[PDB]
Each structure stands twice: as C-alpha cells, then as structure tokens.
UniProtKB/Swiss-Prot annotation, chains A, B:
Nucleotide-binding keyword on record: no
Origin species: Sphingomonas paucimobilis
Binding positions (pyridoxal 5'-phosphate): 112-113, 212, 240, 242
Stored NCBIfam families: SerpalmtaseAlphaP, SerpalmtaseBetaP
Name listed for the protein in its UniProt record: Serine palmitoyltransferase
Gene behind the chain: spt
Family matches, as Gene3D superfamilies: Aspartate Aminotransferase, domain 1, Type I PLP-dependent aspartate aminotransferase-like (Major domain)
pH dependence: Optimum pH is 7.5 to 8.0.
C-alpha cells in the first residue's frame, strides 16, 4: 500500500535500535529547568543541541509578554491573516522585524519552513531561475520544488561555481540567488561578500537565510551579511523565530517597494492560520531585546570559542578550522562511532545532535553542538570534560 | 525584476481600494473582548468570519494551560521534533488526538497547511496517484504540487466522476483519495459514505480533511466521516488546531500500523521547529474538552440554524439549501454588490469574510459567515437585523 515505501526506513531505524542506543528521534525534555538544562530519561541533562542561541525562551520579559497575550487575546487567532486573522500583536512583530533589520518590508509566516517554501516558490516563476548552494536547508529545496522555476545548484561555498553557473544562464530572465549566512551542517560561514558581488554582476536578486546568525552577527545582530558589510545590498533576508527569537514563526524582510505585494500571491501566507497572540507577543518582545542583547551575545561567542577551541585541542576533527558560528560539528569516522559517542554523552548527562546519512552526505557522521548564551563557563568545561571522557572511552581521540 | 509579476495584483488591489472600501486583507482586531466581539477600526464589532467554531480561545482551562506551559517550559521548543525538539506537552497533544479520534497513530505538524503539504507529498510518490475533489483546500493542492505523484482531479462532490476517474487508473499502483468533510467555500458537506465506498471499490486509501467539523460532527465530534458511519474505514484523517481547537498546528491521525514511520520520511515534519509549549498545552487541553463539549456544540448548531434559516428567509441566496455546517455562504450577483454589502456590515459593526475571484470561481461572489458556539441568540438576531439592513440598503434582497 502507500506505506510500503517506508519499509526500508522502518528496517534501518530498527537496525539502529538493535545497536542498543536510545531512539534518537524520540528524546523527550520531560522537564526543562532552563535554556541549558532539562530532565531527560530521568537524568539532569545539559542541552547542547538546541538552536536557542540567545536563551530567550526563559527571558522574564518574553514570558510575561506571552502570558499577557494569552490573557488579553486568547489562545489563538481567527484563521488567515487575509481574513479575520490579524491581531494587534501581528502588526507589532512585523514592525519589530522592520526595526531590527532596518527594512521597510516584513512579512511574517507561521513557520520558518513556510517562509522559505513560500518566498522561493512565489518570487521565482516559470522561465525564471533559482540558484542555490548545494547544501541549502531542506526548506529552501522544498520551496524550489513547490515553485515552477528552473533550479540551478552550485558547489557548496564555491564562489567560482556560482559565477560559472550564473554566467551560463540567459541574461534576461529574473534570477534569485539563495544563500545562507551560517550553514547548519558544519557551522561554517558563507563568503557572502564575494557571492553577492557575483550575484550582482549577473543582475540577480539575492535571498539570504540568516536563521543561524540572528542576534549575534553584525553590529546590529542582523546576520552574516551585516557582518560582511552587505547592508543595503541584500534584496531579501529570510529568518525564523525558532532559533535566537525563541518561539515558532518565519519571516522575510526587504526594502523592495513592491515587497508587501508578496502577501497577495504567496500561498503559504494566504492559506494558513496566523500565529497565536502569545507567539507573536513573545517574538515581538524577544526580537526587540535582541537588538541590544550585548551581554548575551558576548557570552554566546565566548562559549562557542571555548567549546570549539577545547574540542579541537583534545583532537576531535571539527567541521570548521576556526570558530565561525555558534555551531560546533564534531566529525566521526563511522556511524557506530557517532552512536556510541552520542549514547555515552547522553548517559553522562549531555544531549547533542547526532547527524548521519542521509541527513549528512554518505561520507560524513557528525555530532552537532549548538552553543547558548545562557551556558555558563562551568557548564562549557563540564561539557569538555564529558567529550574528553566519551571520546577516550570510545577511542575517538 | 522578480516582483514585476505582481504588478497586476498591485493594480487590482488598488482598484478595489479606489471603490472606497476598507482594505479587506488588512483588518486588525485591535482589541478582542471575546470569541465573538472585538474592536475593529475603533468600533465594537461582532466577529462572524473566524473559524473559532467552539469558542475555545478564551476557555479558562485553555488559557491557564497556556500560561502554565510558558512558566514551566518557556516560550519555545528547541528546534525539530527529531532533534532537541520534543517536550512533554508534544507527547500529550499527540495522545489527546489519539483519544479524541480513537486512533493508535497521531502525528502533529507545526501548521495544518504543513500537515496537508506533508502527508500528501509523503504518502504518494512517483507512479502513484492522488485523487482529489476539484475544490479541495489550497494546502491539499500544494501538497500535490510538493509531491511527485500523478494528480487526478474530479468534479466537486460528484460520486459519479470520482468513480469514473478512479476506474480509468491502473489497478496496481497505490492510490490516495483526498476528501474534505465540510468544504469551506460554500459550507457544504461531502457525501463521504458514497465516495469512500467508491474509493474502497478501487482499492484506494482515503484521506479526509475534517478541519471544518472537529468537535461538532459525529457522536464523538470526530467529523463528517464519523457522522456518516465511516468509523474504522478512513485510512487517514487530517485536521488543524486553528479552527475548533483554538491555536496553531496541524495533524494527521490513523490506525495504520506503519503510520508512525511517516515521521521518518516527512520533510515538513522533519525540517521545522516543533510548536511552543504553550501552543501544545492549549491544544491538548482544548482537544480534551472538545471530547465532551456538548453545551457548546448544541449552541453552535442552534446558532448556525438560526443564521442560516433567517438569512434564507430574508431572500439571500445561500451556498447550501439546508444548514449543513457552521459556515453560511451568502451568494451575491457581482463583486461590487459583495463589497458594498461587506462594507455596510463592517460599518454597522459586523465582520464577515468576503470571498471573490480568484478566491472563488469567476462566476461567484460570497460573504462567508462562520458561526461560533459562543455567539448568543441575541447576537445572532443582531446579525440578522444587520444583514437585513445592509441587504435592503444595498438592494440585494
Ligand atoms: C480545509 C482546510 N484544511 C487545512 C487548512 C490549513 O490549516 P492551517 O490554517 O491551520 O494551516 C485550512 C485552513 N483554512 C483557513 C486558514 O486557517 C483558510 O483561510 O484557508 C482549511 O480550511
Ligand atoms: C537554515 C534554516 N532555515 C530555515 C529553517 C526553518 O525554520 P523553522 O524550523 O522555524 O520552520 C531551518 C530549521 N532548522 C531546524 C529546525 O528549526 C532543523 O532541524 O532543520 C533552518 O536551519
């Protein structure tokens, strides 16, 4: 039947369970003490696989904003933005985004996935081109799939290939080059400056996904593009509320004068319920605090450097040579090594993300650590001690 | 450039504004007094365009559940379900769905749109078939677009055409027939009994979208399918949290023994953040209350019948001959008539949904009323008085 095509995934999952590891896709934060600590499997566990980069989920202003919205506006909105839909807090979150990015335009979506699905499938139609980095987020690929544009992949972080690939395309059709500031797999940074210059040489518009930089890149927290001096040169910036902001939702911001017209054509914007009052109140409050969250940001980068530097010192192979983001990827030799390492850490009271094929390429097996501005120096050293103990026990280092 | 393709929509929107009507896609609930009353444009306005069928958004248990979750678990989850992701309240909402639908299987998504996008694109692959009603929700069409199955449309609520269309397909490939219990455009009901019997004759699996029936159809509130005696015959039921439940989120439930394997393949499930603790706590609490919400349900249907019956009595042409759902669609002769009627009601203190081409077919212009179990008989008569005053002032009736 229709589910028979899953027999292979069901077998592979059971074969992983046969190894004796905890089901990695069924971990439950039974209790959450803080942005960095939760009770998992009855054990107090340090969290190092969240993308809660700025620890805003327990910020007292954020929580109070959320509680106030539930009291004032209820548990939900009344369907689509384009119908009953739009509450006061939705107009506020959009303005919070404008103020944060210094843009005239801001369209919020009900998820980050849907923002990418939507903006990509809506901006580029038949006969037009979407040119994307080969390791773009799944939501970017799905957006290409939802659209009817021609899709053009280029080699990962290759300025050369972007240029050659763009150059071969016909000049007249409109083009969208899709980049990410920080790429989530290895925690590496795009050379946006060079890629944007290449994009503009060929007359292409540029979309940058800054989900993994919001709040802690650039002088205003706007992302890698702002860090690299590209203010006013990026046509569209996409992001999410689910990383630094600390809730759900997606968005695209832009200074294009027609940008608000996307609301009129964008199906994942039109045909879904708007976010609950509490979600947009917490996002609004968090976003605004993120404009001037210097202490958090400093601690985030201090934590990232300590984890990255310490893990490299012990002899772990990392995804990046230098500490370029709040993601640190530990690269392991085989899938078994990853699992035992992952289980060891979990059992010792640390949760990190495990990444394996097909999540990664066939020749790559990762443990992905995501640093939080609310990790303490003590926690970071405890994690280092834990990686040292696990790596040595498993024979990785 | 990429936005030039919107010039036509920008012109049409401005041409509507030239008429002198309020921008219908920018209405803001500045304040919300209750499920049925809000301050819009500085005026106390009755809400009749929400899909808040059961008035759960201000249920005290729902709100308290939401507040407790913000306090205990924070403003957000830690990314994808398949990673840090899953909190206690996510396991609870899924079980609440199982208990509500009497199913072993329940997969929650971050939106209803994404549940449809995801389940349809994931269940039917290359060489397989998706057979859908021609007026299926936009999210169902988009799911077909996201997949690589063959798409087969049949004439709206035509059991005959479904049968002929299915019959022509090759017998061996797996097939998904997609139906809705209540169709949102006219508020009409599908003949699921006959369509399911046809679907099963051709060996097809059936997906039913019961977004517009949850809580008030069937002896358990499960939807039109339960109302029509189809318990245990529907392979998958899709729904949303954004209508009766009173927040955001989507879901699919099923008794298929492999159903949980969809989590392993479903991209819009894998590659998006899980819902915030407050969202899943409010959904959980609402869903459970909806199992035994008889007073609300009785009032909902009593309200629907009064509005439907009263509007028909005055001489309005309605989408349905009898009161078949909580949606009442008033059919108008031309787009101007719809607008002036819509503006008149708004100005008199009533918001209803306006539907026009291309939202509707070229030969259809609708005002769509959605009834709420928390409307009072007094409000319903006030609305009737308002439709009477507007219709007569505009010359509709
Ligand atoms: C039958 C059906 N199935 C699925 C969905 C998607 O639900 P979501 O809005 O919760 O994503 C809707 C949405 N319907 C509303 C928005 O909530 C709309 O204006 O389109 C629907 O009507
Ligand atoms: C670069 C990028 N762009 C967009 C998204 C989508 O954001 P959403 O999870 O808020 O929908 C993600 C999600 N990333 C996480 C889930 O939040 C994941 O595990 O895939 C992302 O990494």
């Amino acid at each position: 039947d229709l589910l028979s095509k899953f027999d292979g995934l069901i077998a592979e999952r059971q074969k992983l369970l046969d190894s004796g590891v905890t089901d990695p896709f069924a971990i439950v934060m039974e209790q959450v003490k803080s942005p960095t600590e939760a009770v998992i499997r009855g054990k107090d566990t340090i969290l190092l696989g969240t993308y809660n980069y700025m620890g805003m989920t327990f910020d007292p202003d954020v929580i109070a904003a959320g509680k106030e919205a539930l009291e004032k506006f209820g548990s939900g909105t009344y369907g689509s933005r384009m119908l009953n839909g739009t509450f006061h807090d939705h107009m506020e979150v959009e303005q919070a985004l404008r103020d944060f990015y210094g843009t005239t335009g801001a369209i919020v979506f009900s998820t980050g996935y849907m923002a990418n699905l939507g903006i990509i499938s809506t901006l580029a139609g038949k006969g037009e081109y979407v040119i994307l980095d080969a390791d773009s987020h799944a939501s970017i690929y799905d957006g290409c799939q939802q659209g009817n544009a021609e899709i053009v992949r280029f080699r990962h972080n290759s300025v050369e290939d972007l240029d050659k690939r763009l150059g071969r395309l016909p000049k007249e059709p409109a083009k969208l080059v899709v980049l990410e500031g920080v790429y989530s797999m290895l925690g590496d940074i795009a050379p946006l400056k060079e890629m944007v210059a290449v994009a503009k040489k060929h007359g292409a518009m540029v979309l940058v996904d800054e989900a993994h930089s919001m709040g802690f890149f650039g002088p205003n927290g706007r992302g890698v593009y702002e860090a690299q001096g590209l203010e006013g040169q990026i046509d569209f910036v996409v992001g999410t509320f689910s990383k630094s902001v600390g809730t759900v939702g997606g968005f695209v911001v832009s200074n294009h004068p027609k940008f608000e017209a996307v609301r009129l054509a964008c199906r994942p914007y039109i045909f879904t319920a708007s976010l609950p009052p509490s979600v947009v109140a917490t996002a609004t409050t968090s976003i605004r605090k993120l404009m001037t969250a210097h202490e958090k940001r400093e601690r985030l980068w201090s934590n990232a450097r300590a984890l990255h530097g310490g893990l490299k010192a012990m002899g772990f192979r990392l995804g990046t040579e230098t500490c370029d983001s709040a993601i640190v990827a530990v690269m392991l030799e085989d899938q078994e090594q990853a699992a035992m390492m992952w289980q060891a850490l979990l059992d010792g009271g640390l949760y990190v993300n495990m990444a394996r094929p097909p999540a990664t390429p066939a020749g790559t097996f990762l443990l992905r650590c995501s640093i939080c501005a609310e990790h303490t120096p003590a926690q970071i050293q405890t994690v280092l001690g834990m990686f040292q103990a696990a790596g040595r026990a498993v024979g990785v280092i």
